[PDB]
Amino acid sequence: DSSRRKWNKTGHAVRAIGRLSSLENVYIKADKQKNGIKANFKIRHNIEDGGVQLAYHYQQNTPIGDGPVLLPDNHYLSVQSKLSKDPNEKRDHMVLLEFVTAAGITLGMDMVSKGEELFTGVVPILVELDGDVNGHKFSVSGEGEGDATYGKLTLKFICTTGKLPVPWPTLVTTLVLCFSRYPDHMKQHDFFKSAMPEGYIQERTIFFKDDGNYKTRAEVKFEGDTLVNRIELKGIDFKEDGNILGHKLEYNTRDQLTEEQIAEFKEAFSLFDKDGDGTITTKELGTVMRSLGQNPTEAELQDMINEVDADGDGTIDFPEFLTMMARKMKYTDSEEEIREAFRVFDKDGNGYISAAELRHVMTNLGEKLTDEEVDEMIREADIDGDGQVNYEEFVQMMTA
Ligand SMILES: [Ca+2]
Ligand SMILES: [Ca+2]
Ligand SMILES: [Ca+2]
Ligand SMILES: [Ca+2]
Ligand SMILES: [Ca+2]
Ligand SMILES: [Ca+2]
Ligand SMILES: [Ca+2]
């Protein structure tokens, strides 16, 4: 009914602003002192029975050789991962499909390294990992190929030691960013290929929030025609029954993106896109945000758009909005993020969305609703019947 429908549209607009306010990409910066790069990013692992495990990544890369390399301007990589099982495989294994693209530098105002030439076709890949987490040792072998033209990787991994003592998803980032698609205007910022064929050292520390950490060191280089990733991993301070050693993480996160859900995203999109030209500008994003209480600067609005602007044109195209909302529904929000969403409606911070607060939000968004059909909205969400929406009830409206 067009009352549940109003929860979706308004709810979707609030999680869109949540997405636009978060940092989900792989942020690369030059590190002149090491002749390399450094990176930071946040990974989300869905917890099988509900919630999310965050993994905070810090990364450094260093050329193995003394050839000249490209030190980039600030940019990011966007990564889409799909995990699956080979139904003919009896060993503990993971099948990985990964697409990696560089963006985050807008179009305007101007080279292409020799390493880049090694990546114009399909390149075979080998991966070898030796790990030790809280004294539990394991090895992993992987094979596949990479197609940098489309930023595409296909890789199958076997645990050669028997049972993997951590969940496979926690190893994805560790187990070849030289396969990233860099667009034509950003070819001078591709450190990864510029270091080849002699290769780079890749190091990370990965902090699992409320749990232990991984430390990784990898050598990434050509052995003949093959791109080889050789890794050592050490994990300490894990909890025996946390999400990692207790294996409480989801293996396959669904890309179920229905025609019904796309249509719901288009309804939220059209709240931002008030002139109906199919794109959202800083002006339009600024207008919806001020209407909900917030007061961002031109610069903040430019950054928020930059975070999802795949084509660098300075606006959120409808397809870029569909891409960001698919990510937002594929991976679970932290409690801190759902509470932020709740506080948009819960104006006074008392733990309860009153019908006055919900209308304030609605009529502030230019949504004409009679006291009757505002009450229908509260009805829809209000399980415990107090005529208010508490946190646990909000968390129910905001689910698939
Ligand atoms: Ca580090
Ligand atoms: Ca527009
Ligand atoms: Ca764009
Ligand atoms: Ca465009
Ligand atoms: Ca939310
Ligand atoms: Ca309130
Ligand atoms: Ca209630």
Author numbering: 38 to 147, 158 to 222, 226 to 450
Task: Pull verbatim passages from the article behind this deposition.
Here we constructed the prototype of a photo-switchable Ca2+ sensor based on GCaMP5G that can be switched with 405/488-nm light and describe its molecular mechanisms at the structural level, including the importance of the interaction of the core barrel structure of the fluorescent protein with the Ca2+ receptor moiety. We engineered a prototype rsGEI based on the conventional Ca2+ indicator GCaMP5G28 by coupling cis/trans photo-isomerization, which underlies the photo-switching, to Ca2+ binding. In the present work we introduce the concept of rsGEIs. These sensors show photo-switching only when bound to the molecule of interest.
Several iterations led to variant rsGCaMP1.1, which shows a Ca2+ response similar to GCaMP5G but exhibits photochromism-based photo-switching in the Ca2+ bound form. The variant rsGCaMP1.1 shows a poor fluorescent quantum yield (QY) of only 1.6%. Towards gaining a better understanding of the molecular mechanism underlying the combination of Ca2+ susceptibility and photo-switching, we performed X-ray crystallography. We elucidated the structures of Ca2+-bound rsGCaMP1.1 at equilibrium and the 488-nm switched-off state to 2.15 and 2.90 Å, respectively. The crystal was switchable following 488- and 405-nm illumination, suggesting preservation of native switching characteristics. The chromophore shows a cis/trans isomerization between the ON and OFF state. In both states it lacks hydrogen bond interactions, except from the imidazolidone ring to R57 and E126 (all numbering GCaMP5G; 96 and 222, GFP numbering). This lack of stabilization may explain the exceptional speed of photo-switching and low photo-fatigue. The effect is most apparent with V54 of β-sheet 7 (V151 in rsEGFP2) that sterically blocks the position of the OBF-derived trans-chromophore of rsEGFP2 in rsGCaMP1.1.
